[PDB]
Nucleic acid binder design. Structure first.
Length: 230
RNA sequence: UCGGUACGGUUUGUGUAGGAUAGGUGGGAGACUGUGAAACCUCGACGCCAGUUGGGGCGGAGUCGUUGUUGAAAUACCAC
């Protein structure tokens, strides 16, 4: 509501549909005013989450990561210590990793355990739960295959979830990225949202969609172009 | 003049507190030029939820932005 608020993207038009080629350009020009932040994508789906079978929940593999450091703490014992450090996780724990979590050493981003440690994970997730650093088997951060479980956090697969009022929330990374590296992250989601379209979504599926990143209005994005994201 | 629809803008709700968990939901350490106890709308209905708020007819003139997560996102206020 300031002068610098309207100075950011003072040239974007409301009554003009923009391609993702043009939306990647204006996302750079929106970032020309303020500091670095996380690019946010808002999609208005044409679904109804009142029915249970029309609930939309999935994931997508981004080609260019997520713009996060993604430090991974691994409950690694036995052969798990050699297979977790070979993937990219800087923290290789042990059986005594319980004391290092409740003792004041929280310098990571996600905790990934092994089934030989799952009898002791229940004393951990009470302090990493609301912080967002707890192990979760429902989202793919608890498995015995630690060679690719670490690559799940390193790959940057964003877990989106449609709300009570049929709206999506997706991220493609930082605002200081290239226009081509953000076009492949953005083009991969819509390549996989339509694959997870429910079988009883009446009307037009992806009706309204916008991308804004740094302290301004939303770019009017065109739903009608789903072939030329790059 | 009285309505219906589409699009666009503001505002209203929240057992319980510091912006009545500043609605629901996701992002998120940077947004603001700010004396504000206060005079000029006494928040612009409402003044019951109890203090939401005078959002600038002040002053670009500097000391309420930052801060407590103790509540079923509180915050670093917005990318709905």
């Amino acid at each position: 509501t300031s002068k610098a608020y309207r100075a950011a993207a003072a040239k974007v038009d409301r009554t003009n549909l923009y391609t993702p080629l043009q939306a990647a350009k204006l996302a750079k020009e929106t970032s020309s005013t303020k500091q670095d932040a996380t690019v946010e994508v808002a999609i208005r789906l044409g679904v109804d989450p009142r029915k249970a079978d029309q609930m939309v929940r999935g994931t997508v593999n981004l080609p260019h990561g997520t713009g996060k450091t993604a430090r991974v703490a691994v409950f690694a014992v036995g052969e798990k210590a050699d297979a977790a450090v070979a993937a990219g996780a800087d923290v290789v724990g042990s059986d005594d990793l319980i004391e290092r979590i409740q003792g004041g050493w929280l310098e990571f981003d996600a905790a990934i355990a092994t089934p030989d440690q799952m009898a002791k994970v229940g004393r951990i997730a009470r302090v990493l739960g609301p912080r967002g650093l707890m192990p979760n088997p429902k989202t793919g951060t608890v498995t015995a295959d630690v060679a690719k479980a670490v690559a799940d956090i390193k790959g940057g697969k964003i877990n989106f979830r449609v709300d009570k009022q049929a709206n999506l929330h997706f991220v493609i990374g930082k605002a200081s990225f290239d226009e081509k590296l953000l076009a492949e992250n953005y083009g991969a989601a819509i390549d996989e949202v339509l694959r997870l379209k429910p079988s009883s979504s009446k009307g037009r599926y992806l009706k309204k969609i916008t991308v804004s990143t740094t302290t301004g209005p939303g770019i009017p994005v065109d739903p009608s172009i789903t072939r030329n994201f790059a």
